[PDB]
Symmetry: C5
Amino acid sequence: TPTYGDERLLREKLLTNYSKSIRPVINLTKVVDVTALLYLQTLYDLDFVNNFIMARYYLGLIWIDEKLTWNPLDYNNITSIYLPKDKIWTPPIKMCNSMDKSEENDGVGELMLTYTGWINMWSFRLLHTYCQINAYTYPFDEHTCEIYLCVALHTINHTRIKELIYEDSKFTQNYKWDINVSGKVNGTDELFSYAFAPMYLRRKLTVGIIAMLIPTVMMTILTIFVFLLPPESGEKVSLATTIFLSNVLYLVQIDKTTPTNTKYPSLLMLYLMLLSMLSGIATLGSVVISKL
Amino acid sequence: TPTYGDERLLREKLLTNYSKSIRPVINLTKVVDVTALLYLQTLYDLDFVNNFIMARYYLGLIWIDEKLTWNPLDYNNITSIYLPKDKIWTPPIKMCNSMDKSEENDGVGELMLTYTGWINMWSFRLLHTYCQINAYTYPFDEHTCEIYLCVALHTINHTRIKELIYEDSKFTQNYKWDINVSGKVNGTDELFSYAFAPMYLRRKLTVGIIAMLIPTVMMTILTIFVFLLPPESGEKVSLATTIFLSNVLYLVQIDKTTPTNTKYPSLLMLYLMLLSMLSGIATLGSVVISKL
Amino acid sequence: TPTYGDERLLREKLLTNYSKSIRPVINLTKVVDVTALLYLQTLYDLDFVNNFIMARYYLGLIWIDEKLTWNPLDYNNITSIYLPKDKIWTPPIKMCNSMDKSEENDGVGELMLTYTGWINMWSFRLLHTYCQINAYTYPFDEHTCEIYLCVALHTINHTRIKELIYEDSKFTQNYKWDINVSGKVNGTDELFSYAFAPMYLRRKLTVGIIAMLIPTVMMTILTIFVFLLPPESGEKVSLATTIFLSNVLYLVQIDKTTPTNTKYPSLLMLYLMLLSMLSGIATLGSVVISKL
Amino acid sequence: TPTYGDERLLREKLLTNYSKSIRPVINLTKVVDVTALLYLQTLYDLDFVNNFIMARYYLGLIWIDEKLTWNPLDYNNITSIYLPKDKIWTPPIKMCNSMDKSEENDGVGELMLTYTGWINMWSFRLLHTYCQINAYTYPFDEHTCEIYLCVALHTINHTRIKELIYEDSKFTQNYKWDINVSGKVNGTDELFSYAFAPMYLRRKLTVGIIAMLIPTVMMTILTIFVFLLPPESGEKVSLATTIFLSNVLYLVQIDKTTPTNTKYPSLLMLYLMLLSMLSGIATLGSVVISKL
Amino acid sequence: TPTYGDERLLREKLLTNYSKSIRPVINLTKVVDVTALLYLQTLYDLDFVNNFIMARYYLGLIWIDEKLTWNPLDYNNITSIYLPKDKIWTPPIKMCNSMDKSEENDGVGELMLTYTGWINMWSFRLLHTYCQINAYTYPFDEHTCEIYLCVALHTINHTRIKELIYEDSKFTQNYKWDINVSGKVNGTDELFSYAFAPMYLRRKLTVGIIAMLIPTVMMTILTIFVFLLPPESGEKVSLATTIFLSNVLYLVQIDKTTPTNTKYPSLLMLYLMLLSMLSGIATLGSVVISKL
Ligand SMILES: C[C@@H]1CC[C@@]2(OC1)O[C@H]1C[C@H]3[C@@H]4CC=C5C[C@@H](OCCC(CO)CO)CC[C@]5(C)[C@H]4CC[C@]3(C)[C@H]1[C@@H]2C
Ligand SMILES: C[C@@H]1CC[C@@]2(OC1)O[C@H]1C[C@H]3[C@@H]4CC=C5C[C@@H](OCCC(CO)CO)CC[C@]5(C)[C@H]4CC[C@]3(C)[C@H]1[C@@H]2C
Ligand SMILES: C[C@@H]1CC[C@@]2(OC1)O[C@H]1C[C@H]3[C@@H]4CC=C5C[C@@H](OCCC(CO)CO)CC[C@]5(C)[C@H]4CC[C@]3(C)[C@H]1[C@@H]2C
Ligand SMILES: C[C@@H]1CC[C@@]2(OC1)O[C@H]1C[C@H]3[C@@H]4CC=C5C[C@@H](OCCC(CO)CO)CC[C@]5(C)[C@H]4CC[C@]3(C)[C@H]1[C@@H]2C
Ligand SMILES: C[C@@H]1CC[C@@]2(OC1)O[C@H]1C[C@H]3[C@@H]4CC=C5C[C@@H](OCCC(CO)CO)CC[C@]5(C)[C@H]4CC[C@]3(C)[C@H]1[C@@H]2C
Ligand SMILES: *[C@@H]1O[C@H](CO)[C@@H](O)[C@H](O)[C@H]1NC(C)=O
Ligand SMILES: *[C@@H]1O[C@H](CO)[C@@H](O)[C@H](O)[C@H]1NC(C)=O
Ligand SMILES: *[C@@H]1O[C@H](CO)[C@@H](O)[C@H](O)[C@H]1NC(C)=O
Ligand SMILES: *[C@@H]1O[C@H](CO)[C@@H](O)[C@H](O)[C@H]1NC(C)=O
Ligand SMILES: *[C@@H]1O[C@H](CO)[C@@H](O)[C@H](O)[C@H]1NC(C)=O
Ligand SMILES: *[C@@H]1O[C@H](CO)[C@@H](O)[C@H](O)[C@H]1NC(C)=O
Ligand SMILES: *[C@@H]1O[C@H](CO)[C@@H](O)[C@H](O)[C@H]1NC(C)=O
Ligand SMILES: *[C@@H]1O[C@H](CO)[C@@H](O)[C@H](O)[C@H]1NC(C)=O
Ligand SMILES: *[C@@H]1O[C@H](CO)[C@@H](O)[C@H](O)[C@H]1NC(C)=O
Ligand SMILES: *[C@@H]1O[C@H](CO)[C@@H](O)[C@H](O)[C@H]1NC(C)=O
Ligand SMILES: *[C@@H]1O[C@H](CO)[C@@H](O)[C@H](O)[C@H]1NC(C)=O
Ligand SMILES: *[C@@H]1O[C@H](CO)[C@@H](O)[C@H](O)[C@H]1NC(C)=O
Ligand SMILES: *[C@@H]1O[C@H](CO)[C@@H](O)[C@H](O)[C@H]1NC(C)=O
Ligand SMILES: *[C@@H]1O[C@H](CO)[C@@H](O)[C@H](O)[C@H]1NC(C)=O
Ligand SMILES: *[C@@H]1O[C@H](CO)[C@@H](O)[C@H](O)[C@H]1NC(C)=O
Ligand SMILES: *[C@@H]1O[C@H](CO)[C@@H](O)[C@H](O)[C@H]1NC(C)=O
Ligand SMILES: *[C@@H]1O[C@H](CO)[C@@H](O)[C@H](O)[C@H]1NC(C)=O
Ligand SMILES: *[C@@H]1O[C@H](CO)[C@@H](O)[C@H](O)[C@H]1NC(C)=O
Ligand SMILES: *[C@@H]1O[C@H](CO)[C@@H](O)[C@H](O)[C@H]1NC(C)=O
Ligand SMILES: *[C@@H]1O[C@H](CO)[C@@H](O)[C@H](O)[C@H]1NC(C)=O
């Protein structure tokens, strides 16, 4: 069986004439094809005001190193070792659409190398990735957030994202968003290789949403009556005043929640604006009636 | 008695042919069984809107190194030493359900080694761990937060969590949550070893909660009377208007506190929604009466 | 074709008598002319209360190194290599008008060197840059934010910003601000070289703005009527009281949004102040009428 | 007089056979007695909602090193030197009740060594230390925050906190809290040595607090009259309604300020709850009267 | 002319027998006199609730090294070089009244050395410096914030702040505060050397402030009339109720803005408290009249 000394010898031979900064190919004309695997662990939040989505991912990069092969029979049948990530060449992949808010405490700092040259490198990453949040159909809204991976500085002739496999680990259930992130896309080679995972998020119709809507619908009904109230009923003025005040409060509060950076406005905001306008017109009519 | 020079000699011999990156077993076929001990020090907070729990823990990992044994009689009876954590192999345990918000000022950076090879490594960790917060029975709500430990990258054939012993240190009393975190669980070996400590949290019925409820119950009574008020009492309109305004304010304020990511809705929110609906119906009936 | 060993030989020769801290000119009397390229990727936000603008840029510095030239025919036709940024002299350019909130996870840490001596060094930078935000014409407001680059400590006789090319990458569309940042400016040499990119930002007239304005205009109309209401109409007092309350609420809420550090005040704030003053005068007139 | 070369020789000899990781005693059976001195500089804040206190301290550790003695007559009368803190053994003292939010810009990173072996090591630390904040007697409330020092990992047989001397530097006056932190306590040796400084904080009766009291007392008086108002005065309904609305607003606002993690509730919260209940009962009585 | 090799030789000779941790004087009995130059670049904010002031400064330390002199005629007339700040002794000056929130991205990390021994070391520092904010005369308030520099650990017999020159760079204009920070003060030598720059800040009377006031003055007038309103006018009750509600809202909102840690209270808070008290007394008188 392999022993501690055998692996010490192997690690001594592997790193002898190895340069961490030279791309690991025998012939420099060859590209290193990196395959990326992005698995969502949990979707922490989807911030509308800041147009961001906060989530946690398991990102794994797989590639082949041609300087780091060995014959397992010469080392008591060692077929794979674990090296520190900072001793070996590693593809310069970046989350170039996101703020990577990971700590060093969540950093693995280690990779697995196989005797055939294949490296698997896995890590946890907390990402604040920018999303264009279209609140047009609020609260029945759907969004698409694209999480980008890209090769930092190297040309598509040096390092390439062969493929991006993106999935949902199903580690946690959200109960607020229906997440759909599953697929497999080739890399896009335009002066530098990149790819992105499309994450589709559909707000779930929790009856808390229904509770939020009940005041809106009943206030619409009540405003319809007060606008229909007889011209000289007797309580027109105060009733219309209070109802317009409530409508203004709702119109103010909805704006503070709906995003201001949207492709189209929320239909609910327009509906409440029209409702407040009609309430104001009803109060104006009541004032005119009082004049007469 | 042992002296400074004796320990200098011992530390010189221990680290001579030692590789920090090789797993510390004579035969590479043997697993290293790590036993983890997680003690709660203080539970800082249980953030409902963010679905997080912020707490401080004392985490201790115990394992055995077979490269780091010695005979105490050859070193003037030295039976244990303290080594910097970064000179020796340490298990790659991660809190893979948490944000580890510890500083380097709160990092011990040192471990204790015994002449038999047993290492104890203790640390303080401040964790923001994701919890699925079910506010269904608010404010009589109970929650379960699972704190996960997992071996980062290695297979269950290399490194394993033998056991996870989790307790409450009782260093501070909370006065807001009844914490129940005490037990001892074997690690789960599914392609990589992990375990989790279940923390049960029952909100304590402080009379501040009762103060928050008194307005709700008395407003229920008041709404019942105003809905029961005679059709032509004389103050029906204004009274019902103010009652509905207060009900809407309460329904709005409760939503800003109850979490929007919940398995089931809070019953109190539904109760206040129904109460506001009945208040609106009472105002509608008053309007109809005024019409007649 | 070039091989791994050829590039090892090249990198060994290049760095032999190279000093990272000496400015890279054969004759120390020559200046290093750096050309900077600033490309906006996404404009995250424009914070009015803090007078900041948060954005993401792709910054590239291009210069020429005279110690790091080679003949490609002596190295199997290698025409360019990639070096770690911390092994080579790099111009000390600073964003001396911004908080650089970039992480090490978003840091490229590598530059591309050509056989002629030309270095390209690219990076992603998240900048919180201070802007003097003039909310005079809110919500039809325009702003200019100047993003500064400057040579940290060296005199214009050592390092110089030859040029600054600034553009918009058009990676994302904003839907809230119309961004205009495109041009090319020579560096300014006054005891140390610097330059700045002017970013012109015009608020887009989204109909959400129109929804925000509708209450203001209709309240102006209604206040005009209530001030015009007959002296003894019958509901003057309560109507004017509620309308002044609403005007005060709007005047309070607008202040919390408009910035307090502005060259001139917002015209809308003055308009609402005058509207509230007229509402108060109307209530005063109603009180006087009630006295008579 | 001593010269640069003399101190170079001294520093060369002191560190010759010195091990930074070995506890600095000739005989390993001896304890190192550390004396800690904690001086408050300024108390930044006392956060009630988070149960924290933020302050700045100047912390000094004094101990004796037996490997680092010299005869000043052999070095041209050098009696003390200053060494970098990371070259020498320093006690592993932690603020194990606090979050240490200090930067490296506020880190001295240097200690003073005397020819007799005595080390003084001073530092500035910004601490967020957890406090159990009892708002029972708000706003005449007193609190006690214990700031803990403890030896990180070592047994009381290796490193001991001999003494903790804690004072107030009086650098700034607070005007909001009366701070009382002055004393001298032996360390507690229970499987590891620790100690704590008790900081007593009495809220100062600033008339801004009294101004906050003014509305509560006058509203109590007004509620007493409205509850005493004649059954058929004429304005009972509206007056009671508005007064109950104001009472509910006050009861809601006080809760958002008083902490929810308290040993006992604030008496002011209970008082306002009772007052709101009596206002509701008065409105109920008015409703009953209107029925009759 | 001097060449790359000449500077390589010079830098090789300068650092040969140089100790970065030894204070740079031939005779250890001599002090190193440091002159500090603090220039305000921009004043970001003056946070009243936290009692802080956030600003950006350009800080330059100038001193003389006696180990780092050379004859420029022996090095082809090289008269000054630039060294990395971490290779040379640097005075241990701290901003010991501030939180230094600077990043490594805004860190120059380099100093200029002249053949006569003189070192200039300049840097950008973003400081959060604690200020005792006296809101007594709000909004016509003036404040004094003292920014402290101090020698970290060394006695006045080793390192001294000879002088402190503070100015305003005038890079940006504030439009909210009139800043007056200009002067030149000797250092204070009391067991360790320190100095401070006094920054005087006078709130500018922007009409945004005048606008905030208009509601206060007109509400004072309106309260005066309602208190003067005839005992049986007819609308006394409702009018006084609404006036008191608005007064209470203003008194509540002003408190949330004025600081609670002040030498004296704000006069405006007392004025609004008195106005609310008089409004309450007017309502009490109206209640008494209704009783009669
Ligand atoms: C998630 C995404 C990753 C980042 C990204 O979108 C978001 O950001 C975009 C900006 C692009 C760069 C803009 C300018 C240049 C300069 C050009 O060289 C001219 C030099 C010469 C001019 O005068 C000197 O004089 C080379 C190409 C380069 C670097 C672009 C590369 C692709 C980039 C990085 C794009 C990329 C898709
Ligand atoms: C607290 C918890 C810790 C993290 C965790 O939940 C939360 O997150 C989950 C996601 C899981 C990984 C998903 C995908 C793969 C890829 C597979 O390799 C296929 C390669 C081949 C495919 O095509 C190449 O082509 C190897 C296994 C691995 C890495 C999973 C490991 C277990 C993980 C980390 C789970 C774990 C329980
Ligand atoms: C985006 C922008 C970058 C930063 C910046 O605006 C914002 O900030 C401004 C402050 C300026 C410095 C102020 C003072 C001095 C001292 C002087 O030396 C006298 C020494 C002698 C006095 O008595 C000793 O006794 C040398 C020049 C220097 C360092 C200025 C350089 C330019 C600076 C950095 C300006 C620059 C434009
Ligand atoms: C400000 C304060 C500092 C931190 C502190 O309160 C706050 O936190 C408390 C938690 C305590 C630890 C809990 C458990 C153990 C395990 C035990 O070993 C059994 C091993 C064996 C079991 O089965 C293996 O199988 C050794 C002692 C130790 C480490 C305690 C030390 C004291 C600690 C750190 C206490 C300390 C006072
Ligand atoms: C901006 C400002 C910088 C910081 C500062 O205000 C704010 O903070 C103040 C606290 C002071 C220290 C308090 C206590 C001591 C102990 C004494 O030694 C006795 C040892 C002996 C006792 O028994 C052992 O047994 C030596 C002096 C020292 C360190 C003071 C130095 C000056 C300091 C740092 C002051 C300084 C002005
Ligand atoms: C490199 O190129 C040569 C010639 O093209 C070829 O013979 C050799 O096999 C290549 N090396 C590898 C590893 O493919
Ligand atoms: C090497 O290990 C593999 C996997 O355990 C096994 O199948 C094979 O028989 C081994 N060969 C030798 C020579 O040990
Ligand atoms: C996810 O979205 C894609 C494209 O929008 C669709 O093809 C796929 O069916 C969706 N997945 C599920 C589970 O609905
Ligand atoms: C992706 O690349 C592979 C590799 O050649 C190719 O077979 C495939 O057609 C490409 N497109 C897709 C959608 O897989
Ligand atoms: C390693 O394996 C060999 C053969 O299986 C055995 O003799 C030896 O005792 C093992 N070493 C240890 C430390 O168990
Ligand atoms: C070694 O130390 C242990 C523990 O103090 C003691 O019991 C034993 O007698 C000692 N033996 C020798 C040889 O010193
Ligand atoms: C804690 O919870 C577990 C399971 O929910 C239970 O068995 C145990 O009795 C509880 N502990 C206490 C002290 O109630
Ligand atoms: C855990 O592992 C031990 C070790 O063999 C075993 O005896 C025990 O049955 C396992 N299960 C539990 C619940 O301890
Ligand atoms: C340096 O200066 C000398 C004389 O002025 C000149 O001959 C030489 O070409 C210069 N070197 C370079 C690289 O321009
Ligand atoms: C060197 O490479 C360039 C670019 O591929 C090519 O045009 C040229 O012919 C090559 N020369 C030799 C000698 O290989
Ligand atoms: C951007 O602004 C500059 C100067 O204000 C102007 O010359 C240019 O035309 C503008 N660009 C566009 C696209 O309007
Ligand atoms: C900028 O510098 C170049 C270089 O000489 C010069 O030709 C040009 O006139 C300068 N001004 C502008 C606006 O480009
Ligand atoms: C160490 O112990 C020996 C014997 O107990 C004693 O002679 C010696 O003085 C001790 N060393 C010190 C520094 O106290
Ligand atoms: C050493 O220095 C001390 C303090 O300055 C002084 O009292 C003593 O006389 C000096 N002795 C010698 C030999 O220099
Ligand atoms: C501080 O508190 C302690 C105990 O509570 C007391 O003995 C001491 O007198 C107090 N100090 C002052 C100045 O009141
Ligand atoms: C603290 O320790 C000293 C040292 O022996 C002792 O004299 C004293 O009695 C102890 N207790 C107190 C309160 O100082
Ligand atoms: C150091 O002191 C000696 C004697 O006091 C004196 O001769 C010498 O000039 C001094 N050195 C310096 C650099 O002042
Ligand atoms: C050295 O440089 C200075 C400044 O340029 C110049 O005045 C002087 O003549 C030069 N001397 C020599 C010998 O080069
Ligand atoms: C700044 O303040 C100082 C002292 O308060 C005063 O002497 C000086 O004249 C002031 N400067 C200006 C420009 O007002
Ligand atoms: C400051 O120190 C210098 C240096 O001796 C002295 O001339 C001056 O009088 C001192 N005071 C002031 C205000 O400059």
